[PDB]
């Protein structure tokens, strides 16, 4: 059981065909894990389409993707990625109509860029994008939970701030009770940390 | 605000920052330079993430630019009408006749369509 990312583009939402697309998606065995209707901004779309950086089609692609609200979905199935690529069909609508006439591109697409849907390519990209739009959606307990990767994770990100916090606490040596020390170290971590700034008013 | 909206009273329409519309009645004769307050319709409190301020409508009246002499006569008759317990029977009959004539369904001007 895997899961992939898929978004209905503004062209199939401006024409009111989103609900039919969801029904078709569900009829073929998929299961919508999470859905959300949302309008990207220019910066968010540019960060989203990072792989095709400085490409020739990038201006029109980012201009179309932020013309209206889109739908974002996570679809779960044993063969979710390949099945969604097959159902979604060929990437060019004019080629799609000739090749596979009963496919989402042929049925709802209108142009090379207005293909009316977007899917993932590989499991790494799928997981990355699911994390991009659903930061709180759990998943992938195998690659993340890995003793070598976990030690690297703690050392690279969590350890630099923690070592300073445990030192300051050893210097200060607050009350021997647990709760006071825990609150002190938590406040220290939330006060001075590398990535976030300090808020003053 | 139009002057007759101030005196007679209407409902202001405001679209809040949240995706909710809002219709607030005018509760009395709005004074010049007065204001209205809708509690719980301001920005959230930075301290507590539930309570909010109160939206404040600052009212700037839009007085009519032109008035005829008959309109002024009607306004003076409206601004000096005796209290309803002091009115003669002639006064009540005249008021009833005028109201039935101003709200005449085909030849009265109570409701007209913009050209």
């Amino acid at each position: 059981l895997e899961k992939t990312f898929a978004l209905i583009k503004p062209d199939a939402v401006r024409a009111g065909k989103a609900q039919e697309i969801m029904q078709l998606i569900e009829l073929n065995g998929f299961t919508i894990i999470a859905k959300q209707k949302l309008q990207l901004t220019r910066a968010r779309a540019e960060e989203f389409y990072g792989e095709h950086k400085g490409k020739e089609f990038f201006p029109k692609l980012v201009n179309f993707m932020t013309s209206g609200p889109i739908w974002a979905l996570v679809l779960a199935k044993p063969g979710a990625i390949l099945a969604w690529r097959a159902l979604m069909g060929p990437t060019n609508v004019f080629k799609a109509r000739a090749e596979q006439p009963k496919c989402l591109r042929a049925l709802y697409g209108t142009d090379g860029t207005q293909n009316a849907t977007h899917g993932s390519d590989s499991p790494i990209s799928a997981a990355r994008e699911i994390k991009f739009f659903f930061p709180t959606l759990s998943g992938d307990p195998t690659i993340y939970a890995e003793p070598t990767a976990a030690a690297e994770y703690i050392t690279k990100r969590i350890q630099p701030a923690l070592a300073k916090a445990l030192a300051a606490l050893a210097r200060e040596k607050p009350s021997a009770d647990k709760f006071e020390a825990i609150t002190f170290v938590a406040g220290y971590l939330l006060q001075n940390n590398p990535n976030k700034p300090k808020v003053l008013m | 605000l139009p002057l007759h909206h101030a005196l007679i009273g209407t409902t202001l329409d405001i679209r809040t920052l949240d995706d909710r519309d809002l219709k607030v009645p005018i509760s009395d004769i709005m004074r010049p330079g007065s204001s209205l307050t809708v509690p719980g319709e301001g920005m959230p409190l930075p301290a507590t993430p539930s309570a909010r301020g109160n939206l404040v409508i600052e009212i700037d009246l839009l007085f009519p630019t032109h008035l005829t002499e008959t309109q002024k006569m009607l306004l003076r008759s409206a601004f000096f009408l005796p209290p309803p317990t002091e009115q003669n029977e002639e006064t009540k009959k005249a008021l009833r006749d005028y109201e039935a004539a101003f709200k005449h369904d085909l030849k009265g001007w109570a409701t007209v369509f913009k050209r």
Binding site: - | K92, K93, R96, A100, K103, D105
Partner: protein, 51 residues
Amino acid sequence: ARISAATVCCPRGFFTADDDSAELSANDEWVPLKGREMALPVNWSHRYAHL
């Protein structure tokens, strides 16, 4: 009895009151008032004698 005398009513001019007796005779010349005129209480009259 009390409610009937105060509340039961008829449009004004629909009847004619006999000058001698309390009896009311239907008026032949009554021209109806149409519309929101029947909402003014000056256009109605009592149908039963005052208690």
